[PDB]
Amino acid sequence: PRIKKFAIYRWDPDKTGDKPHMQTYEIDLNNCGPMVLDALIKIKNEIDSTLTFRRSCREGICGSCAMNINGGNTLACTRRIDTNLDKVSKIYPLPHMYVIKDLVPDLSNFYAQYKSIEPYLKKKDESQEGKQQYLQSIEEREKLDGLYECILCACCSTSCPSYWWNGDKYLGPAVLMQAYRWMIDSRDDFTEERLAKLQDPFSLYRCHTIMNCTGTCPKGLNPGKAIAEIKKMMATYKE
Amino acid sequence: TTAKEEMERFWNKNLGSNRPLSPHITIYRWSLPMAMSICHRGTGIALSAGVSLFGLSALLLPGNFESHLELVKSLCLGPTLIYTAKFGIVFPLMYHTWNGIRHLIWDLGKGLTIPQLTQSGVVVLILTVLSSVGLAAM
Amino acid sequence: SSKAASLHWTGERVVSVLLLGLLPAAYLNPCSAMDYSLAAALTLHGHWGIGQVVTDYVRGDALQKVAKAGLLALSAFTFAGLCYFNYHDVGICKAVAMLWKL
Amino acid sequence: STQYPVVDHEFDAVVVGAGGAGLRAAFGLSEAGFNTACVTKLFPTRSHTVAAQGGINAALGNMEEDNWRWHFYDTVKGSDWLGDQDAIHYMTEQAPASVVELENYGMPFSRTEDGKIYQRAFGGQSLKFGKGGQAHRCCCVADRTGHSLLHTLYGRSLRYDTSYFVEYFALDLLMENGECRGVIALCIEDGSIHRIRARNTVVATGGYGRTYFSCTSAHTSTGDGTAMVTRAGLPCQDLEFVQFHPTGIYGAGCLITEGCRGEGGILINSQGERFMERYAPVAKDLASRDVVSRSMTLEIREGRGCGPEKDHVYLQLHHLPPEQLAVRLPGISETAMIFAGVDVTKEPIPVLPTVHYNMGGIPTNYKGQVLRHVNGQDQVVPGLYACGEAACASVHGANRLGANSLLDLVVFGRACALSIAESCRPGDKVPSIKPNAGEESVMNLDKLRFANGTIRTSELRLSMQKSMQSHAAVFRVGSVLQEGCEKILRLYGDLQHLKTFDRGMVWNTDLVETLELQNLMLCALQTIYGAEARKESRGAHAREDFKERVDEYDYSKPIQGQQKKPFQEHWRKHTLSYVDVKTGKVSLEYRPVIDKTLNEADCATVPPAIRSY
Numbered sequence A: 001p002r003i004k005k006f007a008i009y010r011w012d013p014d015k016t017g018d019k020p021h022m023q024t025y026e027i028d029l030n031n032c033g034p035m036v037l038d039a040l041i042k043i044k045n046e047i048d049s050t051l052t053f054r055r056s057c058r059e060g061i062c063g064s065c066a067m068n069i070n071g072g073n074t075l076a077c078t079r080r081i082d083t084n085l086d087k088v089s090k091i092y093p094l095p096h097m098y099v100i101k102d103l104v105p106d107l108s109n110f111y112a113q114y115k116s117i118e119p120y121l122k123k124k125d126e127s128q129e130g131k132q133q134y135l136q137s138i139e140e141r142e143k144l145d146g147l148y149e150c151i152l153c154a155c156c157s158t159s160c161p162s163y164w165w166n167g168d169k170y171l172g173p174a175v176l177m178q179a180y181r182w183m184i185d186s187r188d189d190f191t192e193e194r195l196a197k198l199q200d201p202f203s204l205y206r207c208h209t210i211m212n213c214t215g216t217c218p219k220g221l222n223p224g225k226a227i228a229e230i231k232k233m234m235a236t237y238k239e
Numbered sequence B: 001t002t003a004k005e006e007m008e009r010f011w012n013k014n015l016g017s018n019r020p021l022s023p024h025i026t027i028y029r030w031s032l033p034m035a036m037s038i039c040h041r042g043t044g045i046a047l048s049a050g051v052s053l054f055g056l057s058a059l060l061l062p063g064n065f066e067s068h069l070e071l072v073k074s075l076c077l078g079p080t081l082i083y084t085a086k087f088g089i090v091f092p093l094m095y096h097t098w099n100g101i102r103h104l105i106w107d108l109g110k111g112l113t114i115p116q117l118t119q120s121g122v123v124v125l126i127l128t129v130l131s132s133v134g135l136a137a138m
Numbered sequence C: 001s002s003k004a005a006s007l008h009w010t011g012e013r014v015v016s017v018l019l020l021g022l023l024p025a026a027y028l029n030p031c032s033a034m035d036y037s038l039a040a041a042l043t044l045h046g047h048w049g050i051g052q053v054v055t056d057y058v059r060g061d062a063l064q065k066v067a068k069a070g071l072l073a074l075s076a077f078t079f080a081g082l083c084y085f086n087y088h089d090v091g092i093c094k095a096v097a098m099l100w101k102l
Numbered sequence D: 001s002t003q004y005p006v007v008d009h010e011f012d013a014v015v016v017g018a019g020g021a022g023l024r025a026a027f028g029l030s031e032a033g034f035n036t037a038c039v040t041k042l043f044p045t046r047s048h049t050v051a052a053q054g055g056i057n058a059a060l061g062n063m064e065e066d067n068w069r070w071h072f073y074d075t076v077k078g079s080d081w082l083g084d085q086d087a088i089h090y091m092t093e094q095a096p097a098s099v100v101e102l103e104n105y106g107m108p109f110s111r112t113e114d115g116k117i118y119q120r121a122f123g124g125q126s127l128k129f130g131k132g133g134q135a136h137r138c139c140c141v142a143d144r145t146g147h148s149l150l151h152t153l154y155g156r157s158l159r160y161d162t163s164y165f166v167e168y169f170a171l172d173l174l175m176e177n178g179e180c181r182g183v184i185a186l187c188i189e190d191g192s193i194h195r196i197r198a199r200n201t202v203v204a205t206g207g208y209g210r211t212y213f214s215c216t217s218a219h220t221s222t223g224d225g226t227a228m229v230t231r232a233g234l235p236c237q238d239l240e241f242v243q244f245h246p247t248g249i250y251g252a253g254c255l256i257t258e259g260c261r262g263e264g265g266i267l268i269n270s271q272g273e274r275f276m277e278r279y280a281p282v283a284k285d286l287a288s289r290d291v292v293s294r295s296m297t298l299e300i301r302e303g304r305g306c307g308p309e310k311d312h313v314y315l316q317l318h319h320l321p322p323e324q325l326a327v328r329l330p331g332i333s334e335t336a337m338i339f340a341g342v343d344v345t346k347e348p349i350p351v352l353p354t355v356h357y358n359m360g361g362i363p364t365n366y367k368g369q370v371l372r373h374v375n376g377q378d379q380v381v382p383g384l385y386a387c388g389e390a391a392c393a394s395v396h397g398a399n400r401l402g403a404n405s406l407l408d409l410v411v412f413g414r415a416c417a418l419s420i421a422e423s424c425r426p427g428d429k430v431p432s433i434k435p436n437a438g439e440e441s442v443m444n445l446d447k448l449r450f451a452n453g454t455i456r457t458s459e460l461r462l463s464m465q466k467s468m469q470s471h472a473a474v475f476r477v478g479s480v481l482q483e484g485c486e487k488i489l490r491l492y493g494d495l496q497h498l499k500t501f502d503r504g505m506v507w508n509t510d511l512v513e514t515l516e517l518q519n520l521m522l523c524a525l526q527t528i529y530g531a532e533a534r535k536e537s538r539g540a541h542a543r544e545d546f547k548e549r550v551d552e553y554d555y556s557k558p559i560q561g562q563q564k565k566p567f568q569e570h571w572r573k574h575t576l577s578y579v580d581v582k583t584g585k586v587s588l589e590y591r592p593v594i595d596k597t598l599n600e601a602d603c604a605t606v607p608p609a610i611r612s613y
């Protein structure tokens, strides 16, 4: 055998007088896949069938199971469990998010910010669209490598202290990196008014290069890096 | 339903709920970067606090700088205790200064990989101790 | 597109590099000129500095405006108090120098 | 009852699904000015098309020069002549237009020297209708073409007043006298129930790969749309035909793309032989999925596997330039490491034929409209459509050709919209609804929420899956299948004996994964019975006891003075499965494949022929 302990955050909105508490579980790792999600699933199916959490791809490419495992925001389907048993894997939901239940935090705001940047191709003349393919050199395309892959796991933006204290008005990395992604997409024609949308104290400028965001990203992406890049466009673009 | 309207619904819904807030500072991993920006704030705040008291007492207090030093002098001053005080002045000045440079490199878009942060972050601590110990004996 | 928030950013960096450039230039060349610009750069930088901390942690309209003002007083008082000290006393450069010999 | 508040909504259209088919349908409706809802149990991005990697086929003639009719031919061959040729014409013609549309939407395709979309080779594709060698029409976004596809569309989706019900689990259709009036659905968050009613409905829920113990599919691929149709008393089609994708990690099941093979990747068995050349000489393992996985899965049966128990085959990449692996296959490069601990640049991957695509589904026109089968004839269920992996126009028939299903989505999603646009108008009388409508689904809900039996949902699911794994594998035979059948039938009986533990209203995944199981059984039931009755080797369905391909004529021989077989004596026809809810008893009829195209002068009805790549 081989027991590993999991200490996991819990909360039920349908059990009056309940309040945020942790609960431990114990798992023979010989009968369990390597990844943390495997565990949370294995405990759901075998042990406790109350535990509530988000999941789908189990392949680390969809962003459903984002959560704080041992003080760092990642995908549970990609973090392999700590084979060392003296340690007890702690699991919490993503930080400073209103918890709907257990490990299921409310992202509607997160998405709504994603909405607020207009993530799609914009052209001045959309009269010839949907008929010819737009041209883009491989060099112009390469500028998106490192940006286009963003899962929307939201591990980053929810690790940024600026976004903890300013979820309402600050956009956060996830989204800004994508705003940037459209800025330097050659095909797009609205690069300036995209930049114009960020001319306020908060939208962009609550970044203070804390760099927690890039640290925790599940896909090795570098938002901070992209924020910086934005700020440089912001100061040197003309009109 | 627009982006603004969604955001509005979120807050109405959640403020008037009985949902908890997920924890943050309590659970989150301590990183050198984290600590190294916290400090940069703290240091900032202490220096301006320092500059303020200095310019303010210039207008509020009696005498002149000489009189206030001659006051200091007559406090059976230890040469170590002077060094201490003098190191205490210049420790956060130099930290913030060196780290400030690192911030300014970043704003030039430079050196934002998890390698480079641990490297530069470490250098700043080294440059800090050296210039601090250096100046505190000039 | 009034670049009002982005110009504020640029300015911050601009003064920060000045203040980097002043510390050593002052050591090399202590003089009235330097003692004032030191005063200018210090206070301004620290004002915008704290500015941020405030706009980061101080929530709601009334309160922020209030702190923002009470900050501005402090900053104004501070610039004056320094300029004064430069004019009617030793001046920053030399004040430090003396303080150091101690 | 009355523990649940019901909240009625009114709309011009409901699209159930937010995967490329769902998205595309959804907003194409709105674009046409229809007050349109979109019910998806997951956040759109979280859907499966994200997971897709290979590409999306369309003869743009970017690499070489190309003809969509060569695409048609390749597709309809691929279908093993169970694929309905009108819908395949429609698609392959449209594919250029549909892809270009996605690029003008923003999707960042990989580019060429010419700065056009980079297309590449994929399993089963050719030029000059099979004569002119290998073809290169799989348009791709390096290795993450589903991801991009989805987020591009999702992004676009936001540019319209489409009303997205996120994390809302559709329960049943709102049928009334053969006519669909929308959907009733759980609202996962507060637990309340919502009767979304509308003049048309579109069902775009994707597959049921979770009927099996091993699949590339996600945890949410539960055949929910398929099941809802079933409980309307409506037929599903060809659900026995299941695609076993040749590759996919031995352990977890994660897919490694056929783009690996299309970019020059090779398959090796335990004695080192480039073994797929021995089976098919001209394809050499760029062949159809049915054939390649057959080769693989048969080579382990011998005892010639490559692992600690000798149970999987090796997928090689290391002989391809390192730079190539980075540009063309970074996504798979990374998950190969993560799940197997395997570097792709100097080690081969461990792969195993595993469930991947359901070319079965809800029966359809080429116009997206759902079909019933009355009087041995086709009849359009009014106010109900479907598109993507959920539906079965059988654009794929017996075998999905690679990199066509992402095209399937976009093409038919689009069509469903166009087809409603042209037939009715926004604002038109949104049909009424009896006050007690769909109570039974609520009682089903209540039943499962407080359900107190002896078996846990998880354990029953497990059994269903291992059952379908044993008996509905790549190869199957009456004996096995017979056992398999009554096996799935008894588990449908065990739905009385199921313990549900969680009892909350908010985010009760215990109950919804349970619902998901009802849906998955219904699907499993129809899959296995259909399979046992079908006595031929067509496409992905291979009977060892009936290894002959059973058409109306022996097409091996030239026809002419041949005596044609009567409809109920050959197997070139669509399996139409039903099931009586209560007994969990499968009944099933048949309906003919369509061979005529939309225009003979533009595209030639490709007649049946010999099957081998």
Ligand SMILES: Cc1cc2nc3c(=O)[nH]c(=O)nc-3n(C[C@H](O)[C@H](O)[C@H](O)COP(=O)(O)OP(=O)(O)OC[C@H]3O[C@@H](n4cnc5c(N)ncnc54)[C@H](O)[C@@H]3O)c2cc1C
Residues within 6 Å of the ligand: D016, D017, D018, D019, D020, D021, D022, D039, D040, D041, D042, D043, D044, D047, D048, D049, D050, D051, D052, D053, D054, D055, D056, D145, D146, D168, D169, D170, D171, D204, D205, D206, D207, D216, D217, D218, D220, D221, D222, D224, D225, D255, D356, D357, D387, D388, D389, D390, D402, D403, D404, D405, D406, D407, D409
């Ligand atoms: C690993 C993998 C790789 C693939 N690669 C390729 C490729 O390279 N090229 C290619 O052409 N094809 C590929 N495919 C096939 C293709 O991805 C699928 O056929 C396609 O994603 C199906 O799209 P869809 O919108 O029909 O369903 P999905 O994309 O699966 O989406 C289903 C939608 O329906 C919703 N839904 C489900 N149940 C309910 C319910 N009860 N109530 C409300 N909503 C519900 C979901 O929330 C979701 O939004 C791949 C498949 C897999 C698994």
Ligand code: HEM
Residues within 6 Å of the ligand: A207, A208, A209, B040, B041, B043, B044, B045, B047, B048, B049, B051, B096, B097, B100, B101, B103, B104, C016, C017, C019, C020, C021, C023, C042, C045, C046, C048, C049, C050, C052, C053
């Ligand atoms: C060469 C000297 C200095 C340099 C180069 C410098 C640089 C900087 C920079 C770049 C920042 C912004 C950090 C960010 O990007 O978010 C900053 C913040 C700050 N600095 Fe300085 N600084 C210097 C000296 C000082 C001095 C002497 C004081 C006070 C007397 C001071 C007080 C502050 C304060 C209060 C802040 C705000 C802290 C924050 O927002 O995190 N600095 N400094």
Ligand SMILES: CC(C)(C)c1ccc(CNC(=O)c2ccccc2C(F)(F)F)cc1
Residues within 6 Å of the ligand: A161, A162, A165, A206, A208, A210, B025, B037, B038, B041, C056, C057
């Ligand atoms: C332990 C203690 C010192 C109380 C602590 C821990 C963590 C934080 C979080 N960091 C911060 O609040 C912080 C730190 C430096 C710069 C900017 C910020 C920002 F305002 F943007 F968030 C702040 C303070």
Ligand code: SF4
Residues within 6 Å of the ligand: A149, A150, A151, A152, A153, A154, A155, A156, A157, A173, A174, A177, A216, A217, A218, A219, A220, A221, A223
């Ligand atoms: S950036 Fe990295 S972390 Fe932030 S969302 Fe996209 S993926 Fe998840």
Ligand code: F3S
Residues within 6 Å of the ligand: A159, A160, A161, A162, A163, A172, A173, A206, A207, A208, A209, A210, A211, A212, A213, A214, A223, A224, A227
């Ligand atoms: S974690 Fe936060 S403050 Fe800026 S660079 Fe990173 S976003």
Ligand code: FES
Residues within 6 Å of the ligand: A037, A054, A055, A056, A057, A058, A059, A060, A061, A062, A063, A064, A065, A066, A075, A076, A077, A078
């Ligand atoms: S569940 Fe899909 S990212 Fe882990």
